[PDB]
Amino acid sequence: TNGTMMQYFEWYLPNDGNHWNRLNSDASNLKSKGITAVWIPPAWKGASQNDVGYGAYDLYDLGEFNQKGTVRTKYGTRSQLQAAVTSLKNNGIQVYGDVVMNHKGGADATEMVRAVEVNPNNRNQEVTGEYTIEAWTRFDFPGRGNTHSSFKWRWYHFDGVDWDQSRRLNNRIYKFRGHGKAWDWEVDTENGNYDYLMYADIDMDHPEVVNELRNWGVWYTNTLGLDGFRIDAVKHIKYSFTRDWINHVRSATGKNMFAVAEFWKNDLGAIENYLQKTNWNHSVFDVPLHYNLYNASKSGGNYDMRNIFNGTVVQRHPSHAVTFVDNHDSQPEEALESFVEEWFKPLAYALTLTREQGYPSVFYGDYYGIPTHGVPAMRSKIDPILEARQKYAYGKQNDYLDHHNIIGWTREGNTAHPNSGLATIMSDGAGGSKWMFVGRNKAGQVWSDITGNRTGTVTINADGWGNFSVNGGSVSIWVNK
Ligand SMILES: [Ca+2]
C-alpha cells in the first residue's frame, strides 16, 4: 500500500561512470523519504560510452566487457551496479531494471541485405523495388565472446533499418526481404505500422529471437536480482510478444515480477487496446495524464482543473496505471519535450502522490534537478508531498474537482495507519478556500499545511468538515500533524 517508484536518472546525466555509486549511497535516504522502488537506467553497454542506454548494443554486457571503447557503461561497472542493487535491497527497496528489446544499435559491422524502401508515413506501403543495401545488422560482441551467451545477431534477426551505408540516403526506412519477412503485428498503427522506430528493428516473428530474448530476460532478472521491469517502446513491439515475454520471465523465475510498459502515445484508446491485447498482465505509464498536467502548466490558469483526469489511464484503469509528471522523454531538449512547468510541478506531484489510485513515480530530473538545462532540484517541495503519501494518504477518498481553478480531495484515513487522513487543495489560478469532508471522527482536530505554503491551521467542525485554504498557483495539503 502507498508504494512509490523513482526513475533514478535523467537524459543529460554526466558521463562520469559514478552513477551506480551515487544510487548506492543514496539508498537509505530514498527509503527514509518514502521511496519503495527504484527504476534504474539501462544497465547494458550502448552504442558508445555516453549512450543513455537506449542505443542498446549488448544486453549481456553490464559494464563488464571491453566493448565500444569502454568497459563501464555511462553509469559505471557491473560490480558498482551490483553493489548499488545490494544497497537498495539491504534498505528494503525494490529494483526495476529497464528493458530495451525493440531494437539494437551500434552493430559491429554491416551486411549486404536485400530490401525495399517503405513509406515513412505508411510503412505498409513499399515505395521502391528490391535492391541490395549495406545494413548495420551484425553483432558478434568481440569483447565478450561467448561469456553469458553465445547468441550472435545477423540481418535475418531483424525486419529493417533506416540507413544504407553504401548510399547514405536520408529519411528512408528499409524493410528486409526474405522468408517470412514483414513488419510485426500487432503494433501501434500510427504511420500505418509503427513496428520500425530506429536502429536495427528486431524481428519478433523469428523463433530464435523470441527464444533468445526470453532467455536474456531470465538471465537479466537472476543476475541482478530484479523485482520488476520498465519496458521500453512497447508500441513498437509485437503486443503478444511482450505479453508472453513477461509471462515467461515470471514463470521461469517463480517471481511475480512487477512490470510497467512505456506506450508513448497521448491516446487512451490506443493504450487500452494495448492493455487488452497484453491481457492486462502489466501496467503502463499514464502518458495522457502527463500531457494533461503539461498542458495545464502551460495554460496560465485557464486550464479547466475539473478535467485534469479526463482521458487518462488512472481515471479509466487505476490498477494498471503508473502515474508520472515527467520523464526522460518529456524533459528539456528531447524529441517529445513537454516538461511540466516548475510552478505547477508541486500541484502535479500532489495529484499523483496524494490520491489513492495509481502507482506514482518520482522523476530524478525533478527531484535533484537538471543543471544542464537550468532545472533546479525540487526535492524540498516534493519531500513534503512524499511524507503526506507515506503517512497520511490512506483510507476513503472524497473528490472535489468542482471548480475550474480550485480543486481538492480528502482522505479519511484508516486505523492501519496512525493519524492518517488529509485534505489536498490546489489552484492553477487565484487562491481561495473550499469546504471538504474529512470524517466525523476528525471533529475538533486542528490541521496544518504539511507543505508549509499556508501557515495557519484549520479546525474540523463537529460534522467532519473543514474550510481549507490555498494560495494562488499553489497546493496545500492539510493533515492532523
Ligand atoms: Ca517481422
Ligand SMILES: [Ca+2]
Ligand atoms: Ca519494432
Ligand SMILES: [Ca+2]
Ligand atoms: Ca484554471
Ligand code: NA
Ligand atoms: Na519487427
